């Protein structure tokens, strides 16, 4: 499952953003640097696929490797985040458009501080609820 990580990064601006690496439609893996996280309440890692829902294991090298974000949906709130090739946190969704459940809360996931370095000072909270019929256990980071 790890070979489905789009690893396309181009630090042409000499910022060194890649250090911490070590409307949701279809995003091209050729423009993604690192894992893609979607938040069906709980965070879900999205792997590379083709135009069909078939996973690919080429580290996002093929120009036909994409992430089917719209297919990964429960009528519940939805959103995804990822780092694009030049180091800009990209989002999509409607509740916020990323891991932002509350305007001041955020879904904690293993790459929260790399996509959102300013959320390090937030407090974790254990959340458990039934959304759309499934129980969701995750942590929320709020001010």
């Amino acid at each position, epitope marked *: 499952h790890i070979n489905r990580t789009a*690893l*396309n*990064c*181009n*630090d042409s601006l000499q910022t060194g953003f890649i250090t911490s690496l070590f409307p949701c439609d279809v995003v091209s893996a050729r423009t993604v640097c690192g894992p893609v996280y979607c938040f069906t309440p709980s965070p879900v890692v999205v792997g590379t696929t083709d135009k069909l829902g078939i996973p690919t294991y080429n580290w996002g*090298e093929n120009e036909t490797d994409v992430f089917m974000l719209e297919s990964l949906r429960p009528g519940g709130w939805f959103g995804c985040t990822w780092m694009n090739s030049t180091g800009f946190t990209k989002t999509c969704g409607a509740g916020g458009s990323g891991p932002w459940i509350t305007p001041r809360c955020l879904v904690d996931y293993p790459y929260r501080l790399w996509h959102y370095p300013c959320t390090v000072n937030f407090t974790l909270h254990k959340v458990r609820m039934f959304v759309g019929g499934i129980e969701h256990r995750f942590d929320a980071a709020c001010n």
Partner: antibody
Amino acid sequence: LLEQSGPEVKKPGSSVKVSCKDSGDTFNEPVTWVRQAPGQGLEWIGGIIPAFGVTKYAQKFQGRVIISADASTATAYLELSSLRSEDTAVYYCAKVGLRGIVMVGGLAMNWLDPWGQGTQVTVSS
Amino acid sequence: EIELTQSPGTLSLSPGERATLSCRASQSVSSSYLAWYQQKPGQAPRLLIYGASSRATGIPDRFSGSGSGTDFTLTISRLEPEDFAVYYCQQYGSSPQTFGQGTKVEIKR
């Protein structure tokens, strides 16, 4: 700098396993293997990004080499099989710089620093 | 594979003189992905220039590189005794990264 294994001497047709350990916490960052024969310059062999395990190889050693990394130790490995007398060289281990890095499908390329002290691999019968 | 040719094979200069080393590529490489390295006998190569122009942290000012396209040059304006060694040019913009053959700077007496 980076610590590599000592000198090795193996018969033709055998296989070597050269280690490369670093003291810093930059182990997960991309590493690159390069060898240098006596009369020639530096020759790229392959690389690995230990954070994800991506291995990219040069076309020459596509079926003869396998590069691995162990996260428990601080060591990335280069394993060259079916040795020949041409493979007698000094094998080097260096980190790919992060600032200004270019990564295409898991192959990270940039200037190389820091380096390991090198590993002499002698292939003789 | 991009072929990197260095010239001359050996440069014999006295301490204080100017050394200019050349690196010529077969393809037109991008000036942002050329590096120069210094290597002394027994030791590992040390990086001097990256991006064909920028000096590495800890490299004296007398080292300097320039060039674009196929022809690149490294200049040591005032040779010091510890500058005498072999030098290598590397390109890291094409899928198989390549190095040139060594240019050895040697003390003239």
